[PDB]
């Protein structure tokens, strides 16, 4: 997660297979959920704050 | 068994279709 390696936003894939999610908050490329643009961590951090609209804690 | 890729189960297990587990 180096500024330098956030060339992901560059579109210019030369070929669209070189495209890759990346966290829209920490750059955590490794486990980024689509529906949020966030990585498994941030998703959890924000869900705790309440900044994830209608994203309550599951249980059953 | 579940492992023979050219049998009913072998196809079901591998979640696929072919001459051994046709669509219908």
């Amino acid at each position: 997660a180096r500024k330098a390696l956030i060339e992901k936003a560059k579109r210019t894939p030369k070929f669209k297979v070189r495209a890759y999610t990346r966290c829209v908050r920490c750059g955590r490329a490794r486990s980024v959920y689509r529906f949020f643009g966030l990585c498994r961590i941030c998703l959890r951090e924000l869900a705790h704050k309440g900044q994830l609209p209608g994203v309550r804690k599951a249980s059953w | 068994g579940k492992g023979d890729r050219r049998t009913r189960r072998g196809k079901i297990w591998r979640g696929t279709y072919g001459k051994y587990r046709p669509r219908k």
């Binding site: 829209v24 908050r25 689509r34 529906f35 949020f36 643009g37 869900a47 705790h48 704050k49 309440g50 900044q51 994830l52 609209p53 209608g54 309550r56 804690k57 | -």
Partner: protein
């Protein structure tokens, strides 16, 4: 390393969300990244105003945003000149076209985020940690609240060994799913390093 966020834990009850708006699939991620952009600047700016919460409602290209402050003045500005700068700096971020209300905090002494920041700051100024803490719990405890508690991380006093300071009064049931405990965290950059600050305030119950 245990215990959940007291808020996220209670979201179903005794605590509403900071962004209450429907959306989905193709939008949600875009319509959310925004909210963070919003909150981003507000906290970066309205610091001296005393930030505490940033509600963000929506319906369509007419956002809400209801910054909550201790010093509503600092926000607004002279006659309302600043609420002009920001409110505009806002659309230079979201063409969306959005409002910008401002509610005042009735006693910043019951705002976990505030009490936290309050302590976070003192610590940055080099005040005695344990004192600042005890004081804080007192203020909070001394102006309502059926319970309060503050926690400072480590490297108290710049000490080479990271410690952890306490302080608490009255019921502060983290387990009771219905307490209504305000949680607030404050950082604290320093010559020697970061030191997190946690504020917990208990009010009523049911």
């Amino acid at each position: 390393g245990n215990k959940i966020h007291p808020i996220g834990f209670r979201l179903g009850i005794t605590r509403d969300w900071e962004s209450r708006w429907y959306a989905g699939k193709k939008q949600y991620r875009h319509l959310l990244l925004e909210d963070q952009r919003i909150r981003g600047l507000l906290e970066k700016e309205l610091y001296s105003a005393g930030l505490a919460r940033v509600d963000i409602e929506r319906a369509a290209d007419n956002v809400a945003v209801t910054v909550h402050v201790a010093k509503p003045g600092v926000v607004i500005g002279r006659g309302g000149e600043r609420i002009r700068v920001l409110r505009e700096e806002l659309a230079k971020l979201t063409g969306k076209n959005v409002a910008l209300n401002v509610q005042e905090v009735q006693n910043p002494n019951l705002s976990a985020p505030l009490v936290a920041q309050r302590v976070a700051e003192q610590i940055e100024r080099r005040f005695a940690v344990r004192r600042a803490i005890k004081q804080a719990v007192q203020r909070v405890m001394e102006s309502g609240a059926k319970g309060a508690k503050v926690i400072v991380s480590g490297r108290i006093g710049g000490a080479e060994q990271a410690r952890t300071e306490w302080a608490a009064q009255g019921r502060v049931p983290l387990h009771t799913l219905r307490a209504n405990i305000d949680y607030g965290f404050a950082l604290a950059r320093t010559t020697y390093g970061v030191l997190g600050v946690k504020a917990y305030i208990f009010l009523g119950e049911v």
